[PDB]
Amino acid sequence: VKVKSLCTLQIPEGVTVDVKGRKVTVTGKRGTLTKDLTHLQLDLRVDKKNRTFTVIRWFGSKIPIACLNTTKAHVQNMITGVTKGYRFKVRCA
RNA sequence: UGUCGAACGGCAAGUGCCCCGAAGCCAUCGCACGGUGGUUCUCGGCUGAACGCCUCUAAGCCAGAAGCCAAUCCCAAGACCAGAUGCCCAC
């Protein structure tokens, strides 16, 4: 059990990310994307001036440390979604 | 065949026997009918770390078995129904 394990992402200029009890909402160029992260028990916080989002697990062994970079990756797939969006291409073979 | 004397009407033979026979019952020997939703197993996946990449799994999702649970179906308040009601009485 460690005392502080964290990882931060950097919010770009044009994206509003804000949390409300483990429940993020990302408003960019293209719309909003809510992600209900209630099942995780983390300290999600946004700096709002230096534009950076922070996940913190305090006294975690190894199992909740795995859910830190999961949360960081999910918010990045919403910042990519509201700024640039997603497009796939499938092919009939 | 016997027997009321004969014809008539019958009768006896534990329903004499033979043919046809309504109604009723009945045959896969006839006839009619036999329907919906979900959950999630195997599994194949999606995002996604631990483990700067990778990965269906760890959080989280998707789709999904003749299984399972409901709907329909049958009994049904000792499931004690201030569920609704008709009429009398009693407050």
Q: How far is the CA of A23 from the C1' of B62 (A)?
A: 22
Strands A23-27 and A43-46 turn out to be unpaired
Strands A5-10 and A23-27 turn out to be unpaired
Q: Is residue A67's beta carbon less than 7 angstroms from any atom in nucleic acid strand B?
A: yes
Is the CB of residue A43 less than 8 Å from the CB of residue A57? yes
Q: How far is the CA of A14 from the C1' of B11 (A)?
A: 123
DSSP 3-state of A85:
coil
Please give the structure tokens belonging to residue A83.
Answer: 């700024």
Torsion of CA A23, A7, A4, A51, to 10 degrees: -70
DSSP character at residue A20 = S
Residues facing residue A33 across a β-bridge: A26
Please give the structure tokens belonging to residue A18.
Answer: 């804000």
Q: Experimentally, how was this structure solved? A: cryo-EM
